[PDB]
Design an enzyme around this catalytic site. Structure first.
Site, PDB file in Angstrom:
ATOM      1  N   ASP A  35       0.781  -1.220   0.000  1.00 51.79           N
ATOM      2  CA  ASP A  35       0.000   0.000   0.000  1.00 51.79           C
ATOM      3  C   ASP A  35       0.824   1.287   0.000  1.00 51.79           C
ATOM      4  O   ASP A  35       1.367   1.650   1.045  1.00 51.79           O
ATOM      5  CB  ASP A  35      -0.937  -0.072   1.210  1.00 51.79           C
ATOM      6  N   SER A 199      -1.255  16.159 -11.848  1.00 52.02           N
ATOM      7  CA  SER A 199      -1.580  15.718 -13.195  1.00 52.02           C
ATOM      8  C   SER A 199      -1.861  16.957 -14.053  1.00 52.02           C
ATOM      9  O   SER A 199      -2.442  17.927 -13.560  1.00 52.02           O
ATOM     10  CB  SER A 199      -2.787  14.778 -13.156  1.00 52.02           C
TER      11      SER A 199
HETATM   12  N1  LIG Z   1      -4.659   3.412   1.001  1.00 50.37           N
HETATM   13  C1  LIG Z   1      -5.526   2.423   1.629  1.00 50.37           C
HETATM   14  C2  LIG Z   1      -6.904   2.553   1.536  1.00 50.37           C
HETATM   15  C3  LIG Z   1      -7.738   1.608   2.122  1.00 50.37           C
HETATM   16  C4  LIG Z   1      -7.139   0.533   2.776  1.00 50.37           C
HETATM   17  F1  LIG Z   1      -7.908  -0.433   3.371  1.00 50.37           F
HETATM   18  C5  LIG Z   1      -5.753   0.440   2.811  1.00 50.37           C
HETATM   19  N2  LIG Z   1      -4.999   1.380   2.261  1.00 50.37           N
END
Ligand SMILES: Nc1ccc(F)cn1
Length: 330
Positions: A35, A199
């Site tokens: 993430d 952007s």
């Molecule tokens: N950037 C993010 C958004 C939702 C999540 F569950 C985890 N990471």
């Protein structure tokens, strides 16, 4: 040093991507969601409330010879979708595609919210945003990328997400065979702790390009593309029968419609997202209303260039002294 790992979609819609990570000694493999919108490395563990575990692979620090309890440290995180988790912290050896970090903070979940328990294919998250967002108290911890940076050949990581197919996360090097043409680099603002960029505009289908600055974040942890109301309205006005629904919570369209493509600007370069990438299928099984992949960021407060946009390009996260984002067509 370099590291290379395959990332696989969790379902047929590309809702999330899992990448195998080795934690501890002997290795315990867990499938984590990489993430770039968060900075905590957290896993389901032997300590997580038994009722909140449903099919996930857990980390068991007691079976790791290199695991150390970080005395008095706690963590607590809340994501943009109202989901959360919390617990205690250990230090352990962590490896991604042959790239090893010793003494990495591994956040052990004691309590997880419903959306995490329900997602049996995700064993935790590996945050790749800036370390100022890490929630470890009272001593903040560094991300995996921050810890690996000194050993890496180049202080970069690349995201090459597949459309209904496997992809790759590379660390320490740029694969010159994984993209076409040249890479266009753009400036990053680290003030909110995110990979934030601007952007240069957009086009809908074969329409003319509109030059307008769109500030947003590169987020591999978000599934959809969240853009300002004006831009999103301009896109869905080109789909016959499409409308915004309060009951569903966003734009829906007739499943039989053909979706136009969406183009976003990166400097003077253009990235084209095929219309097929914007189809998220029926709102409910059997329904003839389909969910759209381009939604409004009005209620979010931030524009998010999620998986829908990122999977259409080869993306370089340059973590040099002055960070930059690179985009190339593939
Ligand atoms: N950037 C993010 C958004 C939702 C999540 F569950 C985890 N990471």
């Amino acid at each position: 040093s370099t590291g290379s790992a395959t990332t696989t979609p969790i379902d047929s819609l590309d809702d999330a991507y899992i990448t195998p990570v080795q934690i501890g000694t002997p290795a315990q493999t867990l499938n984590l969601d990489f993430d770039t919108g968060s900075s905590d490395l957290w896993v389901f563990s032997s300590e997580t409330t038994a009722s909140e575990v449903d099919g996930q692979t857990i980390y068991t620090p007691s079976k790791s010879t290199t695991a150390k309890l970080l005395s008095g440290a706690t963590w607590s995180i809340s994501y943009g979708d109202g989901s959360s988790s919390s617990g205690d912290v250990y230090t352990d050896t962590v490896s991604v595609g042959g790239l090893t970090v010793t003494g990495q903070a591994v956040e052990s979940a004691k309590k997880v919210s419903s959306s995490f328990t329900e997602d049996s294919t995700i064993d935790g998250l590996l945050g790749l945003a800036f370390s100022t967002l890490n929630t470890v108290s009272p001593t903040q911890q560094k991300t995996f990328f921050d810890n690996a940076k000194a050993s890496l050949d180049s202080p970069v990581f690349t995201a090459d997400l597949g459309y209904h197919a496997p992809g790759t996360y590379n660390f320490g090097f740029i694969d010159t065979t994984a993209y076409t043409g040249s890479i266009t680099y753009t400036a990053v603002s680290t003030k909110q702790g995110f990979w934030e960029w601007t952007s240069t505009g957009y086009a809908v289908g074969s329409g003319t390009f509109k030059s307008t600055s769109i500030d947003g974040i590169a987020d591999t942890g978000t599934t959809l593309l969240y853009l300002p109301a004006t831009v999103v309205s301009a896109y869905w006005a080109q789909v016959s029968g499409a409308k915004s629904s309060s009951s569903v919570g966003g734009y829906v369209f007739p499943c039989s419609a053909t979706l136009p493509s969406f183009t976003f600007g990166v400097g003077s370069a253009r990235i084209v997202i095929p219309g097929d990438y914007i189809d998220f299928g029926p709102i409910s099984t059997g329904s003839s209303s389909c969910f759209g992949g381009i939604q409004s960021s009005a209620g979010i407060g931030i524009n998010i260039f999620g998986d829908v946009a990122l999977k259409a390009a080869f993306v370089v996260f340059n973590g040099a002294t002055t960070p930059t984002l690179g985009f190339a067509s593939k």
